[PDB]
Amino acid sequence: SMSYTWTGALITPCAAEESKLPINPLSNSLLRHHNMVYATTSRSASLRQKKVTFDRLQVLDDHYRDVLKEMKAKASTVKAKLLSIEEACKLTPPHSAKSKFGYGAKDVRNLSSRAVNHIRSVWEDLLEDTETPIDTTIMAKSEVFCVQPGRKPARLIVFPDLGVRVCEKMALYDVVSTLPQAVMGSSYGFQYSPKQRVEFLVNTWKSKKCPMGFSYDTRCFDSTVTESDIRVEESIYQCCDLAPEARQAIRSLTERLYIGGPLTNSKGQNCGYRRCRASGVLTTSCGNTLTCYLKATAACRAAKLQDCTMLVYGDDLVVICESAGTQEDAAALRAFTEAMTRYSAPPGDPPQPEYDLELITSCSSNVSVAHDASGKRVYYLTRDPTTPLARAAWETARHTPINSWLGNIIMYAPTLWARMILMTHFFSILLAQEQLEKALDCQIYGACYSIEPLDLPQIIERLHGLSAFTLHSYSPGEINRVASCLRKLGVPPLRTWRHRARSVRAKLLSQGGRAATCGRYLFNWAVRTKLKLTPIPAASQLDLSGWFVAGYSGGDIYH
Ligand SMILES: CCO[P@]1(=O)N=C(C2=C(O)[C@H](C(C)(C)C)N(CCC(C)(C)C)C2=O)Nc2ccc(NS(C)(=O)=O)cc21
């Protein structure tokens, strides 16, 4: 079966599409090579349509079936609740795509009678009709990148109407929030804050006599997900204790939405048919994580990899195991790839065995080492800053729904690039515009959060510990990756950022209050006569319940 079939109608935009970085003094202070930065548009959609459209080979074996039974035995411990209409409505992002049936996200959030009435009729239709395919919209996603030494085509998103999305929450929010950890335990990546993630990786690595690890990159994961995969996923959901309406909603959503369905473009034209995972549904993250875990765990057994520990974030997979020696690891890994290939999940680039933890990439990130105020080694996660910086420049010049920069500051807070460049740049702008107090939207593990920049110190402390504000003596490799990135993009060198930060820090300290705390903690690296930093009282008091429970990419979730 084909992942997609197409009619010939175009994937169309619903408004003008910007593709060039504007020439703006605020973005230009950060990044001068503006022609290197682009945004994708619907104009490249057909290139992506070609990449994501292919026949799927799938042969299931005893290892797969054994693993699946083990996962279902754990799912059987779960009791999931049906969410009320009110709770589902309050999970809807304020700017979520309006319904085609005369109401939008604001109305959903306000519980207006039209929205509520339409959501109830959608729920009742899920209970009564177990087969009719549910409509979806296909759109090209606009994302910002740096040009390569050419251009990435737009990614495609597929999502159902607002009424359906609210019903998905009712039936499945509790399931997708609870079941993955119940099934996958320590392997489930969305449960970990950044410090907890680094500790898991480092401890797993140090728990092996002679560790070997690898990442495994599936080509076009969503498109490799077969109808069988999606029914297997439902078989796992169905092991939960479920309200009978939830049980029917899940069965109906699985047949009418998740397995596939018709695609309509923005103009209302029939565009094609999907027989693979939709990116824009509540179960995308959970389903992808279960599927990846199932396939990878069974393939580890087929390959005879010894004492495997996996970390899974949707389609993103890392495996750390005991080395059997260079040649035998190389052979085992190739056997792993062939087993995954049989399960429909062939690799983009063949996986490579790695004998150094810092050379393994999970979620484009690697572990690196710096030192705290006392000289003690601290492990932290980092990445190549090229895409974060390109995106930060875009978001400086253009008001954007989700601020990637804020997510990058929060999650990569210990890195030299987030600290020296992103904090300096964005605090400088917020100070000048007197917007330090204005709540901004970002996305953390797929969910949308509204965050005030002035709360950053206590958010960073909780997620990373106080060492985040004292790291120094970064590794030569990391320094040289940042420095070469800055040269490439026309970003001023680190010495310039140090000068700018000292100025920002003084203005913050002069303001007192929460702004002075930002100066003291976020910019202590900028001064030689350091302030002695103690736990922020507000940190222990922060409600970070629901931060690192699950992933919700594509799932239209707001907290
Ligand atoms: C696509 C973005 O949504 P996700 O839930 N979010 C992340 C994720 C983060 O939120 C952050 C952020 C920097 C983008 C803010 N980031 C870095 C986290 C780390 C510092 C602990 C390594 C992520 O990987 N990482 C993700 C990784 C894989 C998937 N796979 S999927 C589409 O099958 O659900 C999804 C996600």
320 Cβ neighbours under 8 A, 6+ residues apart = 201, 204, 205, 208, 211, 212, 213, 308, 309, 310, 311, 360
User: Structure tokens of 243?
Assistant: 């309200």
Q: Mutate which of 445, 449, 552, 558 to test ligand 1's pocket (most atoms within 8 Å of Cβ)?
A: 445
Q: How far is the CA of 170 from the centre of ligand 1 (A)?
A: 24
Ligand 1 closest atom vs CA 279: 32
The residue behind tokens 């824009």 is 280
Q: Give yes or no for a contact between 341 and 216, defined as CB atoms under 8 angstroms apart.
A: no
Distance CA 441, CA 404 (A): 9
Domain edges within the chain: 1-364, 365-559
Q: Which residues contact 161 (CB under 8 A, 6 or more apart)?
A: 99, 100, 101, 135, 137
**Tokens of residue 149, six digits:** 């030494």
Please enumerate in sequence order all residues whose Cβ is within 8 A of that of 186, keeping only pairs 6 or more positions apart, or say none: 200, 309
What b/e sequence results for 470-499 when a residue is b if at least 16 CB atoms lie within 10 Å of its CB, and e otherwise? bbeebeeebeebbeebbeebbbbebeebee
CA distance 251 to 173: 15
Using the structure block, give the residue that is written with the tokens 């989700």: 402
Amino acid at 365: S
530-544 per-residue burial string, b: 16 or more CB within 10 A, e: under 16: eeebeebeebeeeee
Could you give the CA distance from residue 121 to residue 314 in angstroms, rounded to a whole number?
A: 32
157: Cβ below 6 Å to ligand 1?
no
What's the one-letter identity of residue 416? L
The verdict on the CB of residue 553 being under 6 Å from ligand 1 is yes
Q: Is 453 in the pocket of ligand 1 (CB under 6 A)?
A: no
CB 288 within 8 A of CB 233: no
Residue 197 CB less than 6 A away from ligand 1: yes
Distance CA 70, CA 68 (A): 5
The one-letter amino acid code at 539 reads A
316 annotated as belonging to a binding site for a ligand:
yes
Tell me the one-letter amino acid at 527: V
Cβ distance 179 to 80 under 8 Å?
yes
DSSP assignment string, 339-359: HHHHTT--BSSPP--BSSGGG
Ligand 1 near 191 CB (within 6 A): no
In whole angstroms, give the CA distance from residue 150 to residue 555.
31
Which sign, positive or negative, has the C-alpha torsion 409, 411, 414, 416? negative
Nearest-angstrom CA–CA distance, 22 and 35: 9
E-strand stretches of 77-231:
136-141, 144-146, 155-159, 211-216
How many Å is the maximal CA-CA distance in the chain?
Answer: 70
Q: Which tokens hold the place of 175?
A: 């399931």
Query: What technique was this entry resolved by?
Result: X-ray
Atom of ligand 1 nearest to the CA of 412: 20
How many CB atoms lie under 10 A from the CB of residue 16? 6
Name the nearest CA neighbour of 381 among 165, 202, 502: 202
Burial 260-271 (b: 16+ CB within 10 A, else e): bbebbbbeeeeb
Residue with tokens 């799932």: 555
DSSP per-residue codes, 274-309: E-S--TTSTTHHHHHHHHHHHHHHHHHHHHT-EEEE
Distance 349 CA to ligand 1 centre (A): 20
Residue 307, both tokens: 């004492």
Our answer on whether the CB atom of 103 is closer than 6 Å to any ligand 1 atom is no
Backbone angle region of 146, left / alpha / beta, with phi > 0 → left and psi within -120 to 50 → alpha: beta
The residue ranges of DSSP E strands in 177-334, in sequence order, are 211-216, 261-264, 270-274, 306-313, 316-322
Residue nearest to atom 6 of ligand 1 (CA): 445
* CA pair distance 296, 344, nearest whole angstrom: 11
CB 216 within 8 Å of CB 334: no
Was 556 annotated as part of a binding site? Answer: no
Note whether 409 and 444 are within 8 A (CB). Answer: no
- Cβ neighbours for 164, distance < 8 A, ≥ 6 positions apart: 122, 134, 257
